[PDB]
Design a binder for this molecule. Structure first.
Ligand SMILES: Nc1ncnc2c1ncn2[C@@H]1O[C@H](COP(=O)(O)OP(=O)(O)O)[C@@H](O)[C@H]1O
Lengths: 459, 56, 593, 576
């Protein structure tokens, strides 16, 4: 059965703060400092701010303070060394609540009655114990479920620039993320109160607030607990999905703001910087965040991770989107140009990719023609973009018959297939039928990427 | 909208009625196990352990 | 009291300072220069000084004040200009008898000598009074009358003695709260830490538009009362003029103009122009300057004081929101705040982020722009104020790829991107309609349905026309206008007319200084109707080449509709626009007959 | 016992650590975390830990193991999923009975409970034994019939006692060597540092092609047993039917579900290279290492895989080694340099990136394994990369390159191998095999390369000038090249017919396509209009486009006969 320990461990209070700068507090003469320990800085005003030991020396401990170092006095701040890494108290009753960045509740509810104290950093899942997820989720979005299909257990972000409706797309996916009963955990990371209220309103309207736990860290919230928010949200997701055999859909919005928090912390440590000033280990940090998805051999549960991401200047080469593409399994690319043209969702399926569509596509899973239809659509859309560039450069008359057909397909594809209203939930079969109605523009001879056994059966 | 607004009070009363059983169950559980939990907590708080740091 | 130990520009590492807190305020130097602590290393606490550090000597005493940078709030805020730190420029000038800002002037933040007509609120003796409750209103001026005196947000307890109605100076006690046996005396003014946002009961969705009065702005990229706004653009694009034409004629009740790193003559222009303009609000022709306060930290004034000026401006705006006023804080040259942060970080030696800026610039900007937003005030009675932030990000070299511009676009809900190319041609306000956007268009449907029902339809229609003609002109610039159809030629001509007679708004002109919402809607209807009827006429078989000569009169009447002075009244200008629409319809009917 | 002095992420400075050595494994902390020494400066000795360093407290002892990062070479490598530093994931999951990896797990790298049937070699007691000599062979499984266990390299002597035939484990000695007056005991397994390459008698020229299966690669850009490829589908194709006697798949920075897909696909996929369908697991070893695992383990996984492959070619087995995402290994090196504080060079990468990549790629190559009996192996390295500094440093050492074409990948044309930017510097070495087996292969390969290059040159002018009045010959060349791209180069890897195109089928398809081009040029030179020849020879064009569908299972004699009919039909149709 369950095992637990009624144990009391007295905690050392250190008034020996050496210096404080940025988010870091340096202590002076800690006794046996413990790495990645959690400390409680008692300010002279009496307020208590949690911390986290980032680096230790013979007697020093460079504590990062989650709630900011404003007001910390080198002569009256007392640091209390708890004796263990940051552990969130989880429970099955945590569903349906709202928590701040540091895991404390926001709603008028009480402190979460603990069911287990899980370390937020988690533990590495044995790759031999991971099940390859081959059960597609029908997100309802045509440009996702038809060309960049998501499998239940896949960590696929939403690469969207600043000011694009990535919040609307993610809310839509959360609303209609059934299979071809998802519990949701949300980690707001410096999103403005408008975006957080929109997400909360959508989750309440769609009935999801009964089975979702939000970890709201607004832009007004301190900028260092953005490093605890993804870990808290993901250890809650791991708890629910694995140790309650539940299905979890984690939404880690503003991973760009998470990486900005890492940059702020790293730059105050004077560490050797990577590209754009981000820490060298930011690949490993983003990996520790993202890689907590996927199903497991024993426990019937899945964390379908959808970390919304704000690529600055709408660039993939930027370190945050680049490393997120390296770690995660494909990405959903939201295009500023398409949004300006007025399409919703403004998903550009050319940079978009889903690494598990190759397995969850079809041939008995969803439909026989799914994979070939998706490949044909992607190829003809690339041809359409090339034809549009050629027409813009050297005139539309010079375009060939194939190029003109590609332009017509591009127009009828952006304006009728990608374009779908919010709260529209076309099934994958309806999406494939619309795709075919697009592909019937071409003659059967110019559909080369379609396998003939499916072309002759669906054309 | 007026019809929906009128039912809010009835819905609130119905929700309050269903909860009242859970509050009674919580009170009964607390009254039953209060002595045991208090004894365990007191016995843990008193009678301390005394061990130097493992690395010392 | 510590001692200076090192000075390098606007950083003063002061030794023998065990006990100073982060962001505490210190008085660095003999002249008592105002400084804030930003880094602590044992005894030595690195201080940034909001005053010219030249002349400082090692060993100059630095006094720890014991309180973070605090702005004094209360009556007398309105109709005054302030430095970065809360210092009145008028009082500084009259105290120094000179035209220079002396180093270390400590004039009181609010004029103590002026006596205000305090009239007690609903609160009586013995009633429990929580933070932010209103216990009296002072008559500030004819426009900001009933400057309702809030209780400090952190203060609570029961009233023991409230002052009767009369005249009181700020130093005079007005109310004494007893809380747990410790009586605290309250006056007309209360200090507040600028870094800490003022608490509110609950923020609200901003559903009412900040009518800038400029056609392009409030007809294509609306800003709501309580929405963050950004105006990127190179020098001469018109960010300052848009900010001034917003603070001159918006529907905001009170305005906190912040010249963080602006030009001195710009603030002088505001000081001489606002008293000469009158706001039709409050039922009288009261001057604008009675509702605007200014935080002038010009470009050459101390680098560190730019951050103080921004935070002081936003704190004043937050206070006037807690009072219940639709404030609209305007942070002129918000990129100068980013440059001040970069300079201070460079002095500190901190590792840079992208392009020299510190790693926390995005976080600071986000926490600053999150102060905006309509919100119910903290205490009784129920009050619904709003702070709208319209900050002019100034990109380095004119490219929007600046880190400050990106970190501002990531947080602001509106983006009034200016175009240098349109600015050069005097096409003003030079709003780049291609890249500019407003995320409040969906929110404003609930207001455009109540008033001007066809406004959103016209807005999307004109955006469609402008986008189509922009693409068509891009094609024509390389493929010639030979292949254009008659409908495409009409789109080109109509969008050229829109750009040259509707989107362009010649400020500093009698007619088009303030094109209000009703005149903007009528002009918008006239332009859209002209386009639609021209396209219908060409579809009926009439050639566009002949129709242009036939309807040049209608086209010039439409283009001259912007000359209808809004001062003639809503009924008069609406009647003139109805007559113009009738004349337009008759002219097209006669031409197509 | 050294004591920890400072912890900041992976790097763990340890005090009272005199007498240490660089790159020496040290058990860090009370949980015995495995860590390697990266910088010794006086008493201090900076240690990177291959596990989660959270919870380490100053004062935790660290003990020096005295050996570099040692892989455990021996029987039992086959059909085992290994972590970055050769910790058996299957054994960890079985022992811990939990889905997590316990911190400081000490499970042995090789199974110590499985009894192995050992047959003594030609060496008899009293005969002098040399480093790398084979003193016996042990049966492992159906694929590896004789896992000839070597004596550890850099060990020698006169064998004073050799175990008789029978069943043995890996903890029971099977050979005693007298050495230079100091008795020593040898077992079925023996450790070897990953950093130090396994010795050879002499590296040889790689003269036999590694059949990657893909038409584009195996035709235009061949890889030879003992080559390096720098690949950007082919992982399984080289795994299932490449005729490689063994294969060591290595994953660095693999996305978790991609590693899970590999772990769920390799056991399922079966090969019929032997007399019956037998699993690939019996042939392969997987050094699986997802991105979640420590950066030090990510950096070490490449070395573990390459030394496993080195062992399996010292056994005399042609062994491949597919290193997935070597760019992630380079990123691990960059992160380690950032942790230590070394000044980066180029795009933030360590200055010694070229040295590391050279010291890794150069481990490949056919070699005569040291010590009698004479035997030759070949580690064919196939690393995967993702203008980058890692690829511009790889291109200096790799002999083959299959750079991915972004345009061809956007067209969903697989494999999206860039024909202009790819190369294979074994096209001259491999003539010794082409001229012996398929004499016409080099000339036709050059002909196809020339046709594709001419089409690429003409396509720019086509795009810029509309391409209304191309000459008949130019139109023929461009149409032939489009047909080549659509039929020959394109290859549906998942399709049953084109899953693995054998070298003879590729040669025959090249014959058919080049013959079509020559026939078209001859027809144009005859004066007849290509606009009419298109309709006249549409039948032949469809025939050559459908020659792709010839199932290789029909047999070399049968398929080559079918192509000979198609070429014969081609000449007959030329009368039109
Ligand atoms: N809406 C407008 N109407 C008339 N003039 C304008 C307008 N906007 C800008 N200007 C002109 O631009 C100049 C000021 O531009 P400003 O806003 O200061 O740009 P910046 O802030 O980049 O210096 C003034 O000379 C003014 O004549």
């Amino acid at each position: 059965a369950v095992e637990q320990g009624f144990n009391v461990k007295p905690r050392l209070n250190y008034n020996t703060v050496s210096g404080v700068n940025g988010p870091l507090v340096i202590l002076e003469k800690v006794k046996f400092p413990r790495y990645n320990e959690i400390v409680n800085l008692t300010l002279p005003d009496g307020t208590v701010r949690q911390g986290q030991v980032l680096e230790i020396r013979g007697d020093r401990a460079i504590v990062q303070v989650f709630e900011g170092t404003s007001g910390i006095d080198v002569k009256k701040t007392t640091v209390e060394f708890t004796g263990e890494s940051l552990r969130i108290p989880v429970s099955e009753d945590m569903l349906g609540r709202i928590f701040d960045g540091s895991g404390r509740p926001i709603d008028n509810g009480p402190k979460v009655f603990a069911e287990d104290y899980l370390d937020i950093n988690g533990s590495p899942i044995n790759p031999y114990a991971r099940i390859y997820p081959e059960e597609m989720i029908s997100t309802g979005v045509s440009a996702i479920d038809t060309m960049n299909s998501i499998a239940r257990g896949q960590k696929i972000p939403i690469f969207s620039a600043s000011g694009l409706p990535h919040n609307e797309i993610a809310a839509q996916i959360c609303r209609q993320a059934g299979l071809v009963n998802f519990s949701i955990v949300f980690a707001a990371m410096g999103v403005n109160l408008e975006t957080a209220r929109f997400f909360k309103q959508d989750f309440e309207e769609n009935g999801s607030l009964e089975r979702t736990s939000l970890f709201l860290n607004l832009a007004n919230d301190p900028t260092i607990e953005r490093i605890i928010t993804p870990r808290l949200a993901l250890t809650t997701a791991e708890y629910l999905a694995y140790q309650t055999e539940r299905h979890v859909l984690t939404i880690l919005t503003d991973m760009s703001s998470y990486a900005d928090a890492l940059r702020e912390v790293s730059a105050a440590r004077e560490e050797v910087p990577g590209r754009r000033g981000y820490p060298g280990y930011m690949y490993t940090d983003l990996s520790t965040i993202y890689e907590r998805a996927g199903r497991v051999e024993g426990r019937n549960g899945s964390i379908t991770q959808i970390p919304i991401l704000t690529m600055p200047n709408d660039d993939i080469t930027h370190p945050i989107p680049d490393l997120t593409g390296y770690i995660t399994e494909g990405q959903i690319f939201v295009d500023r140009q398409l949004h300006n043209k007025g399409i919703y969702p403004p998903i550009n399926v050319l940079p978009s990719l889903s690494r598990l569509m190759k397995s969850a596509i079809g041939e008995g899973m969803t439909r026989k023609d799914h994979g070939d239809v998706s490949n044909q659509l992607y190829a003809k859309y690339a041809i359409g973009k090339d034809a549009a560039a050629m027409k813009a450069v050297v005139g539309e008359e010079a375009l060939s018959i194939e190029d003109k057909l590609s332009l017509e397909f591009l127009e009828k594809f952006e304006k009728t297939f990608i374009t779908q209203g919010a709260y529209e939930d076309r099934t994958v079969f309806e999406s494939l039928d619309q795709a075919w109605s697009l592909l019937r523009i071409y003659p059967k001879e110019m559909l080369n990427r379609i396998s003939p056994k499916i072309l002759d059966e669906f054309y | 909208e007026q019809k929906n607004a009128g039912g809010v009070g009835e819905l609130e009363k119905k929700a309050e009625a269903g909860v009242q059983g859970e509050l009674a169950e919580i009170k009964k559980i607390a009254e039953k196990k209060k002595d045991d939990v208090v004894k365990i907590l007191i016995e843990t708080v008193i009678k301390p352990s005394a061990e130097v740091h493992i690395n010392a | 009291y510590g001692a200076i130990y090192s000075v390098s520009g606007p950083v003063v590492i002061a030794e023998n300072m065990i006990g100073c807190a982060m962001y505490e305020l210190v008085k660095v130097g003999h002249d008592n220069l105002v400084g804030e602590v930003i880094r602590i290393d044992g005894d030595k606490a690195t201080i940034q000084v909001y005053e010219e550090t030249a002349g400082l000597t090692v060993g100059d005493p630095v006094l720890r004040t014991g309180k973070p940078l605090s702005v004094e709030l209360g009556p007398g805020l309105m109709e005054t200009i302030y430095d970065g730190i809360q210092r009145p420029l008028k009082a500084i000038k009259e105290e120094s008898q000179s035209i220079y800002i002396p180093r270390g002037i400590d004039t009181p933040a609010l004029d103590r000598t002026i006596k205000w007509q305090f009239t007690p609120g609903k609160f009586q003796v013995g009633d429990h009074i929580s933070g932010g409750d209103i216990y009296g209103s002072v008559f500030e001026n004819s426009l900001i009358s009933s400057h309702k005196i809030l209780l400090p947000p952190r203060s609570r307890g029961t009233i023991t003695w409230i002052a009767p109605a009369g005249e009181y100076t700020l130093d005079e006690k007005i109310l004494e709260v007893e809380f747990d046996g410790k009586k605290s005396d309250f006056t007309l003014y209360h200090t507040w830490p600028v870094r800490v946002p003022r608490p509110v009961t609950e923020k609200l969705s901003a559903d009412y538009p900040l009518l800038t009065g400029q056609r392009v702005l409030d007809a294509l990229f609306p800003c709501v009362q309580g929405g963050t706004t950004c105006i990127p653009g190179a020098f001469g694009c018109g960010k300052t003029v848009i900010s001034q034409s917003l603070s001159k004629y918006s529907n905001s009740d009170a305005i906190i103009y912040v010249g963080c790193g602006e030009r001195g003559n710009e603030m002088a222009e505001v000081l001489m122009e606002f008293p000469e303009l009158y706001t039709e609000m409050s039922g009288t022709k009261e001057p604008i300057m009675k509702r605007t306060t200014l935080v002038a930290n010009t470009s050459n004034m101390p680098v560190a004081a730019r951050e103080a000026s921004i935070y002081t401006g936003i704190t004043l705006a937050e206070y006037f929101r807690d009072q219940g006023k639709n404030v609209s804080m305007i942070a002129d040259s918000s990129s100068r705040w980013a440059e001040a942060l970069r300079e201070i970080s460079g002095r500190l030696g901190e590792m840079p982020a992208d392009q020299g800026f510190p790693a926390y610039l995005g976080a600071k900007l986000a926490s600053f722009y999150e102060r905006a937003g309509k919100a119910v005030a903290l205490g009784s009675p129920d009050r619904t104020g709003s702070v709208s932030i319209v900050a002019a990000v100034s990109p380095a070299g004119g490219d929007f790829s600046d880190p400050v511009t990106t970190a501002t676009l990531g947080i602001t809900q509106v983006f009034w991107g200016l175009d240098k190319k349109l600015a050069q041609r005097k096409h003003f306000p030079s709003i780049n309609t291609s890249v500019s956007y407003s995320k409040y268009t969906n929110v404003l449907n609930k207001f455009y349905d109540s008033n001007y029902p066809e406004f959103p339809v016209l807005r999307d229609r004109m955006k469609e026309i402008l986008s189509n003609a922009e693409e068509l002109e891009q094609v024509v610039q390389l493929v010639g206008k030979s292949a254009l159809s008659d409908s495409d030629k009409i789109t080109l001509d109509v969008a050229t007319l829109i750009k040259e007679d509707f989107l362009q708004q010649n400020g500093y002109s009698t007619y088009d200084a303030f094109c209000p919402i009703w005149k903007t809607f009528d002009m918008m209807r006239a332009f859209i109707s002209y386009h639609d009827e021209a396209q219908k006429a060409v579809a009926n078989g009439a050639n566009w080449s002949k129709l242009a000569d036939s309807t040049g009169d209608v086209k010039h009447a439409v283009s001259s509709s912007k000359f209808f002075e809004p001062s003639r009244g809503e009924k008069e200008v609406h009647g003139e626009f109805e007559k113009l629409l009738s004349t337009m319809q008759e002219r097209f009917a006669e031409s197509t007959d």
